[PDB]
Design a protein around this ligand. Structure first.
Ligand code: HDD
Ligand code: HDD
Lengths: 727, 727
């Protein structure tokens, strides 16, 4: 019975559409023409549904899927109802363990291509030819929260890319900050337990603002550098598209001649760097906990493909010990002023998955999954990571055949003498299951190392030392990087860092813990220490006021690449404007607005006080995306209020608060005609004010002003005016 | 090392302490003298920590837990480091599958005691004597969200009680609404999948406001009744302590004579019925996603034990067919005006767990777990539930030995011939592992049914009919209960229902689904349908305008027990008041304020613009609990602003907004002396207005008036005033 509407409006058009225009859908139905080798290789397991009979898992057609089998229609359910038990059994066993860390993540498919051959420095096949494309699957995530936690929390973000290369899978498993909190993997469980929900009551979710995290940080100064990044606006990115990606550790590139080059991996967001502000981010976890997941999926459906530039920081083997920090210390970043990021290639994410569980939830990424031409280093965090990502999927993905889960399968050949394990898919026909063997003539065979298509051979690094459980003495420096980071931020970023620490520490119940953290801040910078201390009602002591600042990092007093906003990098394509409608919209304003927005690739969401439709002054029927309360200003980048019958929304509480919220969160607001009367609500400026666009109508000049504001992301000059507005 | 602070402030006092005064802690440490048989039985597995050496899982002392073993202090990590590998292995496999539904839940220990023997109607041992104390373990939950999802979402709430009886575990697995959405267990997966995050992208979390839920609802009218409950304020409870509890299904009570009585289980909140308002609940999912979990824990730590009264709806076997609706239909409630709830006993929750994962996450509840004196019915939803709850823990808790997990273990004896299975703890010495046997003289033995301590025998219900997959025709009525619920709500409750539907339907992207639900509502009540339709810009057709309303339920045109607020049941103990401080507070007001609150067990939180202290007019040093932004008005029940230097916070946006938010969410507000200046922030006239307490000081009747408002929960007369106001 229950069928599609007559008009076929149940199904989304299979073409790129702006966010909100059509219901979202599985990637292969939304963009059937978007292909790559990995996507095509998944065709063996994709299952359709249209025009097929409903069946059991054993292929038996079901006649009645509305009822259990029972003795009489008001009788007991019978044990022989195998249709019911199969259906319930499958339901009862739907869940699989979520990831210990990074449980909350959003993923997409894409492709990578190098700009030029990198054969002089590496024999890795995927970086050898500019016209050789490598399919990717990328998963972005948060760290602390469960798979059901919110997206816009303050946390580090994970940035994992699976490269399906012709010589094996390469997983580049990184983050959105260039360092990690700890130095040795042996302490991972301590750090993670400290930041995770506390053990007695399992609170708080997706928040570091609790006693145990700050206790750990206070006793483990090595965490301060990544804590600085977390407390900055880097901890609350606007989108996965507008954050940097870093592999954190120093790895090696190995060329065909055997030369090893130290490398640190970077991802540069081609959409620019952009973060939310704390109040916005926190409120957004409540208004839309799926904001980053939704934004990524819709960008891809709209053709606004998340694009990243892969970059390498290359350090010659002879320069290993030439910085004032150890290259193998993952709490230490390599300043771009010292070692520039060389551009390597572009990564484009152009298709969403079909089924989240099957492809995203089951995907297994592991930093040990390298290929010939790449190698590890002795970074002690990286070292311990190699043990963990293979181990963990034995329970998470049920066994050692996790490489056979469709999303994890290599697109290149794979043959070995490994057999069985739970849910073995591969049916091996090889007479032998061991080597050496004569019965299959020793196949599959080992392959000597070589310039191309060779077997993996580890770089023969000289190892010289006693068996010790000891931290390198060169890792024993914890304040210089934190301070380099602090001094590289703009004044408004520095305040946001202050506010982040002050907010977090205010949630720490034990006051001595707050004081210990403030003491640690005094070893980084007294201006910073004092600003936090004042917000906590703490007085720095005389000894604290006399702590000598840490040395500069190899002479650097700052490095602007560490700031999100010091150097403009603002792209408006893919951003969204909230348009506040009224019941007699001036169609001339609306036309100029959409044309201008369309030219720059900026989307629009038409909002009103109710759903359904509104008719403009020229009879144009405008479908309403959401109500003012339904899609808060949190969800958009700027707000436009066109002229029309302004008296319709002039006394609307939600319409007024929409502007106050956007204003508080430093977003550009544009008011046309009688819409300028909303200026009173945001008690500010008579003549005008930088950040607020105004004119008698919405024209070319009005829209160019707004788009220029959006290019700079937020109106930082308005900071001084926001802490009086009651919003 | 010796890192605790000399002064012992790291450790919370082991005595009842109000919320926020001390760091929360594991139950056995916070309240060591609070015991019961189950808590004492868990002593064999409880593990301490203080004064013990740090070891591996095999008992080997660890010398250095900061480092991995490597060849050289900057060398590679060695495979022989078994201390590293064991610690990472345990960490790597910490997670277990979350529950398929109700993954998000908060639990506590407690006890139950009947008021009088129920031997005349049931031979269940736990109800046979008023002096018989039964230890309980209760878990409250949401339904849709994952374990890391938020607490104050709009959803049904789970309410599961594990009764550790002398004759077996009795699990009463209910919810906070008297009905469920579907009629037959075979459609459970259908309904759940429809409400859960959509499969392509896994959005949205913790919400039924999406197309697939409303698609299903519109095609399955049986769901309308529970949908009505969810859309009302019942879907967003103030706390687990202030919601009702129901078993939903009609079960049987069996006495010693063999007589069967139909019974529906009820839980009455002794703190009363109380819910949030939509905007507060949604915002509160952002400001504190653990609000219910925290509130439950802290109430128990303050000694404000959640107390519930078990009640029975009793229906004689001869009255099975005397109602308009089928007694076995779970989408139908039994109106208390027809069948009164008879008070049976009291449940007190007085101790939190020690470890959330071990006790809360691994607890397994199942409604098939009944004891002699209770029995099932043919309710088709219940029938299928009996299959599911044993089945699901084979994956969730790793096997069939899940009753051996400490929290799940019976306190009474258990002996049988079941053996082996993963994680087998019990070491059986019985020579026989089968019955009948002679080698152990047939022990353990079967026990015949009898008045007390006898074997389980099912009630010999007559079964007659053909083997059919068929819904009983008596279940085919879908609108009369929904309508009864609608008509029993107050006008502001009805507005809130209209608002829930309107908001949820606005998040449904396909307009035709919205229209179809509107068509269903028009079968329930025209006023309701029209109001929702208006908010969605949908016009009812003339046909929809003349749909004749469903008949009354057995002559009833309303039943006031179905309303949260129609019949007052306001309890103020355990509620919390925000106190907006200034830098020269009038200490006399503060003393009057704080003592009046303490007298009624109402908690307070002293807030300010920063942390630290503030000095009152007489030099009294006031400890600040949180900042205005740090503990938003969403978390409190009322706000008081004492006299003092009001100009200190008068132009503080946050303080002003605090009052705007609380005013909007209908909470009592009290302003003393110059704190009346804030009236212009909330637009209060000079003469005052109901819901706002105001006077020259906090003396006389100021606190009694404020406490009367708190007793009535929220100021429902202010609804019309909140319409405008930009907050
Ligand atoms: C020693 C253990 C260890 C340590 C020291 C790290 N983690 Fe890790 N992390 C794991 C143990 C692990 C894990 C336990 O193996 C996980 C979770 C489950 C999974 O599959 O892998 C994982 C997941 C995981 C993911 C999610 C993969 C996904 O999206 O599926 C990311 C992006 C990171 N990690 C990145 C980091 C960063 C950049 C780290 C340091 C630089 C780091 N990990 C340290
Ligand atoms: C046939 C399937 C079935 C049906 C029709 C129901 N559920 Fe259920 N229930 C599940 C299958 C299940 C489950 C999959 O077996 C769960 C998941 C986790 C578990 O242990 O039990 C569960 C758990 C579960 C819990 C959480 C126990 C805890 O806190 O651990 C609550 C309170 C209930 N549900 C309540 C109910 C009620 C009031 C429902 C309707 C009357 C209902 N469920 C219908």
């Amino acid at each position: 019975d229950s069928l599609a509407p007559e008009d076929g409006s149940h199904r989304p058009a299979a073409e790129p559409t702006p966010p909100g225009a059509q219901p979202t859908a599985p990637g292969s139905l939304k963009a059937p023409d978007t292909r790559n080798e990995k996507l095509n290789s998944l065709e063996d397991v994709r299952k359709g549904s249209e025009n097929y009979a409903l069946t059991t898992n054993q292929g038996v057609r079901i006649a009645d899927d509305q009822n259990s089998l029972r003795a009489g229609s008001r009788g007991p359910t019978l044990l022989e109802d195998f249709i019911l038990r199969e259906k319930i059994t499958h339901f009862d066993h739907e869940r699989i363990p979520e990831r210990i860390v990074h449980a909350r993540g959003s993923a997409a498919h894409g492709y990578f291509q190098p700009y030029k051959s990198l054969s002089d420095i590496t024999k890795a096949d995927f970086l050898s030819d500019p016209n050789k494309i490598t399919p990717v699957f990328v998963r972005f995530s948060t760290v602390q929260g469960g798979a059901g936690s919110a997206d816009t929390v303050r946390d580090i973000r994970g940035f994992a890319t699976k490269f399906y290369t012709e010589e094996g899978i390469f997983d580049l498993v990184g983050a959105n900050t260039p360092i990690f909190f700890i130095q040795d993997a042996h302490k991972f469980p301590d750090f993670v337990h400290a930041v995770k929900p506390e053990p007695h009551w399992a609170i708080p979710q997706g928040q570091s603002a609790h006693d145990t995290f700050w206790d750990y940080v206070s006793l483990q100064p090595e965490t301060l550098h990544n804590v600085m990044w977390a407390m900055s606006d880097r901890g609350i990115p606007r989108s996965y598209r507008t954050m940097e990606g870093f592999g954190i550790h120093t790895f090696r590139l190995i060329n065909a001649e055997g030369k090893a080059t130290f490398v640190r991996f970077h991802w540069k967001p081609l959409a620019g760097k952009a973060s939310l502000v704390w109040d916005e981010a926190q409120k957004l976890t409540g208004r839309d906990p799926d904001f980053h997941r939704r934004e990524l999926w819709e960008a891809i459906e709209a053709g606004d493909f998340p694009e990243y530039e892969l970059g390498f920081q290359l350090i010659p083997e002879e320069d290993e010990f030439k910085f004032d920090f150890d290259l193998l210390d993952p709490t230490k970043l390599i300043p771009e002023e010292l070692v520039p990021v060389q551009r390597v290639g572009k990564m484009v994410l152009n298709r969403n998955p079909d089924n989240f569980f099957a492809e995203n939830e089951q995907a297994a990424f592991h930093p040990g999954h390298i290929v010939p031409g790449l190698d590890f280093t002795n970074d002690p965090l990286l070292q311990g990571r190699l043990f963990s990502y293979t181990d963990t999927q034995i329970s998470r993905l049920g066994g050692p055949n996790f490489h056979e889960i469709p999303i994890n399968r290599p697109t290149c050949p794979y043959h070995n003498f490994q057999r069985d394990g739970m849910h073995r898919m591969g049916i091996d026909t090889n007479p032998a299951n061991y080597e050496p063997n004569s019965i299959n003539d020793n196949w599959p065979r080992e392959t000597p190392p070589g310039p191309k298509r060779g077997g993996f051979e580890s770089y023969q690094e000289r190892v010289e030392g006693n068996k010790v459980r000891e931290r390198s003495p060169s890792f024993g420096e914890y304040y210089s990087h934190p301070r380099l980071f602090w001094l590289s931020q703009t004044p408004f970023e520095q305040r946001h860092i202050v506010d982040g620490f002050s907010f977090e520490l205010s949630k720490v119940v034990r006051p001595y813990i707050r004081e210990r953290v403030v003491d640690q801040l005094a070893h980084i910078d007294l201006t910073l220490a004092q600003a936090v201390a004042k917000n906590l009602g703490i007085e720095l002591t005389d000894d604290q006021l006399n702590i000598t600042p840490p040395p500069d990092v190899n002479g650097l007093k700052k490095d602007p690449s560490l700031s999100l906003y010091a150097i403009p990098d603002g792209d408006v394509k893919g951003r969204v404007v909230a348009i506040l409608l009224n019941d007699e919209v001036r169609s001339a304003d609306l036309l100029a607005i959409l044309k201008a927005l369309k030219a720059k690739g900026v989307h629009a969401k038409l909002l009103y006080s109710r759903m359904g439709e509104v008719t403009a002054d020229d009879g144009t029927v405008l479908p309403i995306a959401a109500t003012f309360a339904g899609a808060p200003s949190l969800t958009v980048d700027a707000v436009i209020v066109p002229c029309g019958n302004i008296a319709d929304i002039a006394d609307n509480g939600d319409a007024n608060y929409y502007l106050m919220e956007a204003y508080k969160h430093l977003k550009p607001i544009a008011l046309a005609g009688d819409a300028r009367k909303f200026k009173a609500t945001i008690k500010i400026a008579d003549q005008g004010e930088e950040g607020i666009v105004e004119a008698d109508s919405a024209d070319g000049s009005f829209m160019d002003e707004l788009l220029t504001l959006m290019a700079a992301h937020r109106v930082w000059s308005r900071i001084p005016k926001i802490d009086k507005i009651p919003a």
